[PDB]
Design a protein around this ligand. Sequence first.
Ligand SMILES: CN1C(=O)CN=C(c2ccccc2)c2cc(Cl)ccc21
Length: 578
Amino acid sequence: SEVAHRFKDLGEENFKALVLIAFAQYLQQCPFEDHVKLVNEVTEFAKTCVADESAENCDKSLHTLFGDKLCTVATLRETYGEMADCCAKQEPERNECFLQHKDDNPNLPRLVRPEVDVMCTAFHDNEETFLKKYLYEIARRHPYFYAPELLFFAKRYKAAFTECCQAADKAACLLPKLDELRDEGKASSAKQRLKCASLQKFGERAFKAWAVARLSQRFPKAEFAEVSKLVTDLTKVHTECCHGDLLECADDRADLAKYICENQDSISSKLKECCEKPLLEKSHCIAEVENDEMPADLPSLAADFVESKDVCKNYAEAKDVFLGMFLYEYARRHPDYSVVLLLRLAKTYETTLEKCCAAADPHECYAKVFDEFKPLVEEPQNLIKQNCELFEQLGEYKFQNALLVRYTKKVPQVSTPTLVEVSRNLGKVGSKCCKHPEAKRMPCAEDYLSVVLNQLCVLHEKTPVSDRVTKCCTESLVNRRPCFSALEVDETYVPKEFNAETFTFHADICTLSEKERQIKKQTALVELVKHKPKATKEQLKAVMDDFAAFVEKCCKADDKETCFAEEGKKLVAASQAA
Ligand SMILES: CN1C(=O)CN=C(c2ccccc2)c2cc(Cl)ccc21
C-alpha cells in the first residue's frame, strides 16, 4: 500500500492538508464543502489501509484513488464541462488530462476579507475549518503553488490570528502580517511556476543546469560530486510537485532537508540556524539560505577549460559531466552573475567546443573563448545600470508606465489586463533590486525578471494572440529576456477602432482603493497605446494628465454620477484630437 506509506511519514495533519491542496488544485471551481467531504472520505479509507495493508484497494496507486474520488463530481459537466472527458479515460492518461486542464487564471470571484471582528470569531470558534478554508482559497488560485511551502505559510497564517486576536488593537496587529503574507505568497507562487515551466516545457536537463548553477553559487565549498547529488534529488522533488504527486513531493522534500542537515559541514556553513528549527521552517530556511563564503585559494578556470590540451578529449568522453563541471566551476566563484547569465556563458562554451574539437587544431580554435564571454557579461551589467538610473528618477509608478508603454508597442495583441499585470511587476524589479550594490544587483534583477516573463508566457499560452510572444517564449528558456529586449514595435500591428464599450466609465471608481485607482488609470494608458501606437510620450502624458482631471472632478462633483456619462463623452472628443 502506498497511501499508508505516505500516511505514516506525513501523519494525519499534513496528510489531510496536502490532499486538500491537491484536490483544490485539480478542481479549482469545485466548492469547499465537497472537497472537504472527499478529503475526509479519502482519509478514512487510508486509516483502514494502515491497519490492513490489502483491505479494499489499498494496493492502488494514488493516481487511481485520487482520480476516482474527484470523478464522483467531475462527471457533472454542467458544472465542470471539459472535465468529464478526463474521467472517461484510463491511467496514467486520466491524470495528464487533469494536469493539462489547470487554469493559471481561474474565473474565481475576488477574495475580499471580512472585518477583523468576524475573522477572529470564526477563527476562535472553529480553528480547523478556518485554516482548511485558507489552504483551499490559495491552492485553487495557484494550481502550481509549492505544496510543502503552503503548509509553511499556513502555520504562519494561524500564528497571525492566534496572536493578533488577543491584542489591544486587532486590526492594527492583523492587517500588516496578513498583507506581508499575501505578497510573499504571490512571489513564492511565481518562483515555483517558473520551475514547473522549465521542467514541463524544456525538460529536466534544463531544470538541472539551472539547479547546478544556482546551488554551486549558494554552496561554493561543496564539491561537484556533492552538489550533483543535491541537484538530482531536488529535481525529483519538483518533478513530483509539478506533476501532481504532492504527497511524495512532501515526503522526499523532508528527506532532502534531513540529509542536507546531517552533512552540513560538507555543504555550507550558513545552514546551522536552519537545521535547529521545526521541519517546515527548516525546509523553508534552507531554500532561502544566503550563499556561503567563497573558498580562499581557487585556481583559475583557464587552466583546465581552455589552456589544457585534453579539453576536447574530456569533452568527447562525457560532455554532460564535463559541462556540468564547467558550470559548477564558473558559478561557485561568481555569485555576482545571474543563473541565466551563467547558463548563457555555459551554452557559449559548449557551442565552441562543438565546432573547435572537430577542427585541424582545437587548442587554437577554442583558445580565445573567454573573449566571447565579455559581451554576454557586460550587457546585463549595462541594462541594469540604465534602468535603475531611470527608476531612481521616475519613481515606481512612472517607471511602470514607461515599461507599460514599451511592452505594449512590442506585443499589442496581448490582452490589456495581462499587459497591465505584467508591466506592473516588471517595475517592482526596480524597487526590489536597484537598492543593491552591483555585486548583488544582477542576480536580483535578471532572475526576478525571468519569473515575470514566465508569467506573460504562461498567461499568453492559454490564448496565443501574438506569434512574437510565442517565439520568444518557446525558442529558449535561457534567452527569453534578450529575445524580448530585441523586440521594438510590431510593424504589422493595425490599430483598433474606438468604441463606447472599449472602456466603460461607471462612477463606481470613486469607491476603489488608491491602488485600484492607478490600475484603471494604467489600463487606460495601455488602451490608448493600442489605438495610437504612433504617439510619443508628449501626447500620452498630456492625455493621461487629462484623464486624471476627469475622475477628480466628476467624483468630487455633487451631480448624480452622470458627469461621468456627459464628461466621459467630452474627453473622448478631446482625446481623438491628440
Ligand atoms: C523589465 N525591465 C526591462 O524590460 C529592461 N531590462 C531590464 C533588465 C536587463 C538585464 C538584466 C535584468 C533586467 C530591467 C532592469 C531593471 Cl533594474 C528594471 C526593469 C527591467
